[PDB]
Each structure stands twice: as structure tokens, then as C-alpha cells.
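Need a sequence for this fold. Nothing fancy.
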């Protein structure tokens, strides 16, 4: 019954059958209790601080062709852009002036920058006394090594799906094995490492979602980014169903229960499929928010999926808006870089 699943989650009996049953029960009472449990674990382990990561999406050029993504190379109905190094550095400086304590640099897999222009940008931003997170895709070990020597602190590389068959179908340039090898290299090089997955991919099953949770737990990732699949009209998956908000929220809540000391964002995709979805997610296990800091006129050209919020407002609105959010939630802004603070247990 739901009570018995909750009890097993509370005593840390994280078996495959317990996770499947949590994801399969659709009862409102059960779901609300699950969300309350995750919220309480979050508060006890990571407290009330919500860490702000300012994201600059500096290029929408990509060499890969992932079937879900609006930036895929085969999409000709997109104006491509690249920010200059100076633009990136100065836009980072503006975010630090606005109180950001981590800068995230994200792009398509755009060969132009790689590896040396990224290194040069990283060194300049590190002088500002903030954490730097990279989210640039799959590259050789040597590139990751260079970026770590340049001063990068963290790397986000969602595993997308832990089903190797599904992974290869959706990401035909590469494989799950390659994705995992990148994540293991990043861990070995001393990055704080983020993984995570989409929920509601075409062909993805409940057992696949269980395998995503067990994967995350196995590798003890420092950050876990989860959101729904949202179909993009200029992709092969244009006519597929969007991922379910509630199911995706349950994946966030279980991630917190499994990895109680991790850093878990309330992703912009969650706020795209449901109005107020980030705020809900911050009350169901999440403790990080990533306001968009990409400048106009580029911001509106980086749409992995459609409907992305934060496009019509001034490009400096997002940091103040998340600071208001944090206050109205009865939470506090992060006081330091918000690195992982491990609580060793049994
Ligand atoms: C308690 C009050 C007033 C009821 C009354 O007195 N009239 C009613 C009015 C509108 C209701 C919410 C909405 O329905 C949306 C949503 C549906 C979910 O299913 C359960 C959660 C949620 C947030 C509802 C909770 C609650 O039930 C609300 C606040
Ligand atoms: C805000 C709404 C509706 C509350 C409501 O409107 N309930 C009636 C009035 C109650 N009051 C005490 C204000 C007055 C009672 C006297 S009265 O005379 O009105 O009957 C309630 C109903 C269900 C609640 C969520 C669930 O828990 C799951 C989850 C637990 C986490 O931990 C925090 C996040 C989350 C999503 C919760 C948020 C919020 O909390 C919800 C939406
Ligand atoms: C950038 C400009 C010009 C001056 C400047 O270049 N200022 C650098 C500050 C650098 N820090 C953020 C590291 C200071 C931390 C001080 S603190 O005492 O908060 O630790 C300054 C002048 C007024 C400042 C805003 C207001 O204040 C209100 C508000 C406070 C929140 O809090 C952060 C967000 C917000 C919107 C502020 C953003 C930014 O900052 C503004 C625009
Ligand atoms: C009102 C909107 C639909 C908006 C629309 O019209 N589109 C629907 C879509 C997703 C729904 C929430 C999730 O189910 C998770 C959670 C389950 C709890 O039981 C009650 C609280 C909560 C936060 C739900 C409230 C509400 O019901 C939401 C926001
Ligand atoms: C400038 C805009 C409008 C308003 C809206 C919400 C405001 C923040 C929150 O109040 C929480 C917090 C309270 C502390 O006192 C001072 C710092 C901080 C971060 C506030 C700064 C500023 O005032 C904000 C961003
Ligand atoms: N089509 C679509 N739907 C949702 N999520 C997508 C899609 N394409 C790519 N992605 C995901 O974005 C991450 C990068 Se971080 C995303 C932000 N946190 C956000 O929510 O906007 C990719 O790794 C992929 O999972
Ligand atoms: C824009 S998608 C996120 C960054 C990188 N292209 C990746 O797929 O991991
Ligand atoms: S998900 Fe990342 S690698 Fe794949 S097409 Fe989009 S931008 Fe390129
Ligand atoms: Cl980060
Ligand atoms: Cl993320």
C-alpha cells in the first residue's frame, strides 16, 4: 500500500520494487506524502538556502543531431549565433554584479570555442571570485582536463536516459557508454559533476525511470537535473506527447530521498509545462534555481524546446525575479558558492 512504500522510503530500503511501486501509484494522498517527505529531507540535509546559478547560453551552434532538441544540426529553421569571448566575460561580470555566486556557461556542441577559447573565458570569470560550471556536451578527456586547469569547478552532463538502446536511438551521434565515460572522466578530474534525465521521452517506460534513479544513486552525483520532455516542432519528435509534470515531480522527489545531500535544480522546463512549476519543484525536493542570463538578441534563439519562459522581459529581470521567488517561498538566497556539502552516513 502507499503507507508501506513510504515507510520503506523512510527507512532507506531502496529496492527496485519500492521505486517502481512509488512511480506506479497514482493516489493523491500517496503523492502528497511523498512530496512532503522529499521536502522535509531537503530541509534537514540542505536547509532553506536556494542557490542561484546564472546561465549564459553563449552559442546555439551544434554538431550533434539529438532527436528531441531544437538545436539539432538538421534544424535549418533556426538563426544560429555565437557570443564573442568579451561579450561572455562581460555578461558574466554583470551577473556577479547582480549577486550570482555561480556562472553556468552552456552551449550546443559548437567546435569553434573548443578547447582554448573556453579556457580563456573560464580564467577571466574565475578572477571574479565565483564558481564556474560548464555545460558544453561530450568532448575529449584532454579538453576536460584543460578546462579544469583553467579553473572550472563543475560540469553538467545529463545522462538523458540510462536505457542504452533508447539512448542510441535518440542520440544517434553517440551512446550511453560514451556519455557515462564522459561523466566518469569528469568525476576523476575533480569536477563537481551533474547528471540527470528527461521524463516522458517517446518509448521510455516506468522501468526505465527506475533505472534512471538507480543510476543516479549508484554514481552519487553532486547535481541532478531532471525535467519533462517537451516536443519541439522543428524536430523528428514534434508530434510526440509531452512528459507528465506530476510524474517528473515524483522523479525529483525520489532523487532527493535517494541523494539527500545533493544539489537539485527546479528546472526551467518544469516552469514551462506548468505555470509556477519551478516553485512547486522547490517545495518537493529541489534547492537550486538557474535564472536565464543570456542577453537579447540571442536569448530568444536558444530554444531547446518551445515556450521557454523568461523571453519577453528585460534580460536583467531573471535574477531579481528569482530573489523575489525565494523570499515568497519562505526560503533564503545562498550565502556561498553552494557547493555540495556531503553528510556521510550509513
Ligand atoms: C481549499 C480551496 C477552496 C475550496 C472551497 O471552499 N471552495 C481550494 C480552491 C482551489 C483548490 C486548488 C485547485 O483546485 C488546484 C489544485 C487541485 C488539486 O487537485 C489539489 C490542489 C489544488 C492546489 C487545490 C487545493 C484546494 O482544494 C483549493 C485551494
Ligand atoms: C496551498 C494548497 C491548498 C491548501 C489549502 O488551501 N487548504 C485549505 C485551507 C487550510 N488553511 C490552513 C489555510 C486553513 C484551514 C481552515 S479552513 O477554514 O480554511 O478550512 C496545498 C494543498 C496541497 C499542498 C501540497 C501538498 O501537501 C504536497 C506538497 C507538500 C510539500 O511539503 C510542499 C509542497 C506541496 C506541493 C504542497 C503545497 C501546498 O501546501 C498545497 C498545494
Ligand atoms: C550592479 C548595480 C550597480 C552597483 C554594483 O556594481 N554593485 C556590485 C555589487 C556586487 N555584490 C552583489 C557582490 C554586492 C553584494 C553586497 S551584499 O551586501 O548583498 O553582500 C547594483 C545597484 C543596485 C543593485 C540592486 C539592488 O541592491 C537591489 C537588489 C539586491 C539583491 O541583493 C541583488 C539584486 C538587486 C536587484 C541589486 C542588483 C545589483 O547589485 C544592482 C543593480
Ligand atoms: C492546476 C494545474 C493545471 C493547470 C492547467 O490548466 N494547465 C495542475 C498541473 C500540475 C498540478 C500539481 C501537480 O499534480 C503536483 C501536486 C499534486 C498535489 O496532489 C496537489 C498539488 C500539486 C502541486 C498539483 C496542483 C495543480 O493540480 C497542478 C499545478
Ligand atoms: C529589487 C527587487 C524588486 C526585490 C524583490 C525581492 C527582493 C529580495 C528579497 O526581499 C529577499 C532578500 C531580503 C533581504 O533583506 C535583502 C536581499 C533580498 C535578496 C531582496 C533584494 C531585493 O530587495 C529584491 C530582489
Ligand atoms: N525537447 C526538450 N525537452 C526538454 N528538455 C530538453 C529538450 N531538449 C533538450 N533538453 C534537455 O535540456 C538539457 C540541458 Se539543461 C535544461 C534546462 N535546465 C531547462 O530546463 O531549460 C539537455 O541535457 C536535455 O536533457
Ligand atoms: C543545450 S543541451 C545541454 C548542453 C550540451 N549540448 C548537452 O547536450 O549536454
Ligand atoms: S541536446 Fe545538447 S548535443 Fe544534443 S542537439 Fe541539443 S545542444 Fe546539441
Ligand atoms: Cl552549478
Ligand atoms: Cl539542469
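Here you go.
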Amino acid at each position: 500500500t502507499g503507507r508501506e512504500i513510504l515507510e520503506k522510503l523512510e527507512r532507506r530500503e531502496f529496492t527496485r520494487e519500492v521505486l517502481k511501486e512509488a512511480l506506479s501509484i497514482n493516489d493523491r494522498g500517496f503523492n502528497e506524502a511523498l512530496f512532503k517527505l522529499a521536502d522535509e529531507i531537503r530541509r534537514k540535509y540542505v536547509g532553506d538556502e536556494v542557490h542561484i546559478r546564472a546561465i549564459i547560453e553563449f552559442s546555439n551552434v551544434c554538431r550533434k543531431n539529438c532527436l528531441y532538441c531544437g538545436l539539432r544540426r538538421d534544424n535549418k529553421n533556426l538563426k544560429r549565433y555565437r557570443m564573442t569571448p568579451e561579450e561572455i566575460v562581460e555578461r558574466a561580470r554583470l551577473a556577479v554584479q547582480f549577486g550570482a555566486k555561480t556562472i553556468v556557461l552552456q552551449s550546443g556542441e559548437d567546435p569553434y570555442x573548443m578547447p582554448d577559447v573556453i579556457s580563456d573565458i573560464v580564467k577571466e570569470i574565475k578572477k571574479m571570485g565565483v564558481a564556474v560550471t560548464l555545460s558544453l556536451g561530450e568532448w575529449p578527456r584532454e579538453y576536460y582536463e584543460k578546462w579544469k586547469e583553467a579553473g572550472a569547478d563543475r560540469y553538467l552532463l545529463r545522462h538523458e536516459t540510462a536505457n542504452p538502446v533508447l539512448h542510441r536511438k535518440l542520440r544517434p551521434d553517440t551512446s550511453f557508454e560514451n556519455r557515462l565515460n564522459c561523466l566518469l572522466t569528469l568525476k576523476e578530474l575533480g569536477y563537481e559533476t551533474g547528471a540527470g534525465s528527461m521524463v516522458g521521452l517517446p518509448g521510455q517506460t516506468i522501468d526505465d525511470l527506475v533505472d534512471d534513479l538507480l543510476f543516479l544513486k549508484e554514481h552519487d552525483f553532486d547535481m541532478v537535473g531532471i525535467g519533462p520532455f517537451i516536443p519541439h516542432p522543428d524536430t523528428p519528435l514534434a508530434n510526440e506527447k509531452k512528459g507528465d509534470f506530476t510524474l517528473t515531480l515524483k522523479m525529483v522527489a525520489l532523487t532527493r530521498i535517494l541523494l539527500p545531500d545533493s544539489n537539485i535544480p527546479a528546472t526551467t522546463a518544469m516552469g514551462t509545462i506548468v505555470p509556477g512549476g519551478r516553485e512547486i519543484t522547490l517545495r518537493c525536493g529541489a534547492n537550486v534555481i538557474m535564472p536565464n542570463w543570456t542577453p537579447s538578441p540571442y536569448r530568444q534563439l536558444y530554444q531547446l524546446y518551445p515556450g521557454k519562459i523568461s523571453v519577453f522581459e528585460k534580460d536583467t529581470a531573471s535574477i531579481p525575479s528569482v530573489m523575489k521567488m525565494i523570499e515568497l517561498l519562505g526560503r533564503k538566497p545562498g550565502r556561498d558558492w553552494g557547493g555540495r556539502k556531503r553528510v556521510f552516513e550509513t
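For context: The chain has one domain: 1-346.
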